[PDB]
Amino acid sequence: TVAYIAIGSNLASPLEQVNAALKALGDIPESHILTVSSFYRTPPLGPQDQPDYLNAAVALETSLAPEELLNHTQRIELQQGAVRKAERWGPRTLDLDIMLFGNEVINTERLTVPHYDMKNRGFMLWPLFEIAPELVFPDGEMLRQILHTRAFDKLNKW
Ligand SMILES: Nc1ncnc2c1ncn2[C@@H]1O[C@H](COP(=O)(O)CP(=O)(O)OP(=O)(O)O)[C@@H](O)[C@H]1O
Ligand SMILES: Nc1nc2c(c(=O)[nH]1)N=C(CO)CN2
Ligand SMILES: [Cl-]
Ligand SMILES: [Mg+2]
Numbered sequence: 001t002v003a004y005i006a007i008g009s010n011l012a013s014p015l016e017q018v019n020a021a022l023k024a025l026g027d028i029p030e031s032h033i034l035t036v037s038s039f040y041r042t043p044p045l046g047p048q049d050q051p052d053y054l055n056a057a058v059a060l061e062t063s064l065a066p067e068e069l070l071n072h073t074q075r076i077e078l079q080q081g082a083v084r085k086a087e088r089w090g091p092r093t094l095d096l097d098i099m100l101f102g103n104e105v106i107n108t109e110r111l112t113v114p115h116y117d118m119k120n121r122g123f124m125l126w127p128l129f130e131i132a133p134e135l136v137f138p139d140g141e142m143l144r145q146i147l148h149t150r151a152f153d154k155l156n157k158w
């Protein structure tokens with residue numbers, strides 16, 4: 001199944017974090033990277049007392065169960081020093097969010113797929129569109145069309 005993973009970093013040298021993350025994503029068992037986006041510098045969503053993010057997206061082919069992929073993504077966050085601050089939407093050395101897991105709809109305590117907020121975020125949608133311009137969401141919506149509708153500002157390269 002192709003999983004689409006959003007990468008965000010705004011602490012501790014985001015370019016280094018993102019490169020380290022991509023290496024580690026490629027090392028997850030029973031999986032391999034298909035396509036990587038460009039790297040974009042994006043203003044924070046949420047609290048404004050934090051640095052700009054590097055955002056990217058990756059398409060990962062995997063035979064893992066979605067929760068076992070999440071175990072592996074969370075382990076890479078840990079490996080890279082991610083600390084979950086008290087405040088919502090605060091800074092991170094690395095944030096790996098599962099945007100899509102093929103065409104699956106997943107709603108569990110640990111895991112909500114498609115990512116609950118992705119359709120509201122150009123920092124997630126633009127890098128996804130770069131790597132999967134023909135994507136169709138589980139609900140039948142085209143990514144290309146969501147982008148049109150929302151008219152989100154285009155992103156700046158890192
Ligand atoms: N699609 C998904 N990808 C990643 N984590 C998910 C997820 N759906 C649910 N989660 C859950 O989200 C929990 C909190 O993860 P955090 O990374 O702290 C959220 P965040 O990425 O800072 O905010 P965001 O989800 O609004 O982008 C995880 O422990 C995990 O169980
Ligand atoms: N620009 C930008 N802002 C954010 C981002 C992100 O990846 N990029 N992630 C968040 C929560 O994970 C909150 N805010
Ligand atoms: Cl959907
Ligand atoms: Mg996130």
Ligand SMILES: [Mg+2]
Pocket residue numbers: 095096097
């Ligand atoms: Mg996250």
